[PDB]
């Protein structure tokens, strides 16, 4: 009979890269969470999760820090995800009606 590796079928989205800082707007919240919610609410109907995380990556790559007079003005962030998924992950929201 088929056995499993110890760990599989996980996907992990990270707000930032190894060694770096993730950015948070003191009023509006974290760049990564804001992007994640915008993409997932808009696209979970027809896009799988790894593909939605790619759209999140695009949003995060484009954003820049607004913090004049500190080391964070115009700063950047890049998100990433790692995957041991073995299938498309569609959330199929609101199905069946």
């Amino acid at each position: 009979k088929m056995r499993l590796p110890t760990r599989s079928d996980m996907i992990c989205g990270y707000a930032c890269l190894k060694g770096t800082a993730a950015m948070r707007n003191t009023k509006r919240g974290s760049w990564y969470i804001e992007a994640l919610a915008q993409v997932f609410s808009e696209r979970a109907c027809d896009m799988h999760v790894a593909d939605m995380l790619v759209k999140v990556n695009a949003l995060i790559k484009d954003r820049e820090g607004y913090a004049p007079g500190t080391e964070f003005h115009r700063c950047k962030e890049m998100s990433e995800y790692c995957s041991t998924l073995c299938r498309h992950l569609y959330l199929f929201p609101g199905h069946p009606p």
Binding site: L4, P5, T6, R7, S8, D9, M10, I11, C12, G13, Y14, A15, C16, L17, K18, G19, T20, A21, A22, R24, N25, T26, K27, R28, G29, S30, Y32, I33, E34, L36, A37, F40, S41, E42, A44, C45, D46, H48, V49, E64, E71, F72, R74, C75, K76, E77, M78, L85, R87, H88, L89, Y90, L91, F92, P93, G94, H95, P96, P97
Partner: protein, 154 residues
């Protein structure tokens, strides 16, 4: 916030090459936010509410934890991974929002929980109820202190 539903036709043409994901609830979701400690995480409240709303709209039963020590996070994540509902759901979500360092996140006590320990709680050996089911983790935490200054596009 609103989540547009998939069409019956989308489901019919995609379900065969995707993870089974039709249980109601779709899964349990845990949103664990640490805001009070390492500086106060202003805006962390907005992140927390945003995800709770999002996962509820995506059809998840959402559990919430706030301002936990590293030991409490470990204990409560393990409790969550061991819930019986995982056998009858199709997927799982865990979101962790805090300060962190590469491979670890901070509890409110300034002690570290290693992410490898977190993932292990949900693996095939320790969480047999989620075997072969997709498990999503979203980690909002720094992975180092280096600020990215950005580079000019040539």
């Amino acid at each position: 916030m609103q989540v547009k539903p998939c069409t019956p036709e989308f489901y019919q043409t995609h379900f065969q090459l995707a993870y089974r994901l039709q249980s109601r609830p779709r899964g349990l979701a845990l949103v664990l936010s640490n805001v009070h400690f390492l500086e106060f995480r202003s805006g962390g409240d907005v992140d927390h509410s945003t995800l709770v709303t999002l996962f509820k709209l995506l059809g998840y039963d959402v559990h919430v934890l706030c301002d936990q020590t590293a030991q409490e996070m470990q204990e409560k994540l393990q409790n969550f991974a061991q819930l019986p509902a995982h056998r009858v759901t199709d997927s799982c979500i865990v979101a962790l929002l805090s300060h962190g360092v590469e491979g670890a996140i901070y509890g409110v006590d300034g002690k570290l929980l290693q992410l490898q320990e977190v993932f292990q709680l949900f693996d095939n050996a320790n969480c047999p109820s989620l075997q072969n089911k997709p498990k999503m983790f979203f980690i909002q935490a720094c992975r180092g202190d280096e600020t990215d200054r950005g580079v000019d596009q040539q």
